[PDB]
From Swiss-Prot:
Disulfide bonds join C26-C42, C150-C165, C176-C201. It comes from Fusarium oxysporum (Fusarium vascular wilt). InterPro entries: Peptidase_S1, Peptidase_S1_PA, Peptidase_S1_PA_chymotrypsin, Peptidase_S1A, Trypsin_dom, TRYPSIN_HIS, TRYPSIN_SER. Its main location: secreted. It is found in: Secreted. The record marks D174 as: Required for specificity. This is Trypsin. The keyword Transit peptide does not apply. It catalyses: Preferential cleavage: Arg-|-Xaa, Lys-|-Xaa. One of its GO terms (biological process) is proteolysis.
């Protein structure tokens, strides 16, 4: 997260860190006791044994509750950056309570309204291409950018109806490498997307691009 502040305990009860090969990698959202939602590109085709999920902590490396993976299912229409969601099943079920809870999802068919305020969180870099990442979870609030403006930035075909955008025209506030798969919420803390892709991090005139929960509810609901 670029331009962020520390998350407080309980800010995102459902957030998980996803380590790979013992190191930082992605974020995700706990949907129920045995299921995590993340970005497809975090997991697709990689050895599943490399991943460890941690819930209930502001850190990736201690606290809360961990699990390995039992299975991985990417969206059936995943291609390139498009439809960048995956359902992970956990080897160890994770109960709600305390600072752990399950995500509430954006309504089917919803689409975040341009100019509304969203909050994204993760353990990724604090600068583009940064090598160091923070121990504790960061968050940042940015406005939704219309799909039309996002298509002006990236190209018409590049931004689909299963993506939405968020960021500030001047840059300086964004998700970044290592934040992929983690949550972006609306002002009510409802899960509206997963961190997906963008041109660098926090650059002027290049929004962050998110996989849209409102657009991808059929997949999520079927397999959660």
């Amino acid at each position: 997260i670029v331009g962020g502040t520390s998350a407080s305990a309980g800010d995102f009860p459902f957030i998980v860190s996803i380590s790979r090969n013992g190191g930082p990698w992605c974020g995700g959202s706990l949907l129920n006791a045995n299921t995590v939602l993340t970005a497809a590109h975090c997991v697709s085709g990689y050895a599943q044994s490399g991943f460890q999920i941690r819930a209930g902590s502001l850190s990736r490396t201690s606290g809360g509750i961990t699990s390995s993976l039992s299975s991985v299912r990417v969206h059936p229409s995943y291609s390139g950056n498009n439809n960048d969601l995956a359902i992970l099943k956990l080897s160890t079920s994770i109960p709600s309570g305390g600072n752990i809870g399950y995500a509430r999802l954006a309504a089917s068919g919803s689409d975040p309204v341009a100019g509304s305020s969203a909050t994204v969180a993760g353990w990724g870099a604090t600068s583009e291409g940064g090598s160091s990442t923070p121990v504790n979870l960061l968050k940042v609030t940015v406005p939704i950018v219309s799909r039309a403006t996002c298509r002006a930035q990236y190209g018409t075909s590049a931004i689909t109806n299963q993506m939405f955008c968020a960021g500030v025209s001047s840059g300086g506030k964004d998700s970044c490498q290592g934040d992929s798969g983690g949550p972006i919420v609306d002002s009510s803390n409802t899960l509206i997307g997963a961190v997906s892709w963008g041109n660098g991090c926090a650059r002027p005139n290049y929004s962050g691009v998110y996989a849209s929960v409102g657009a991808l509810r059929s997949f999520i609901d079927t397999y959660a």
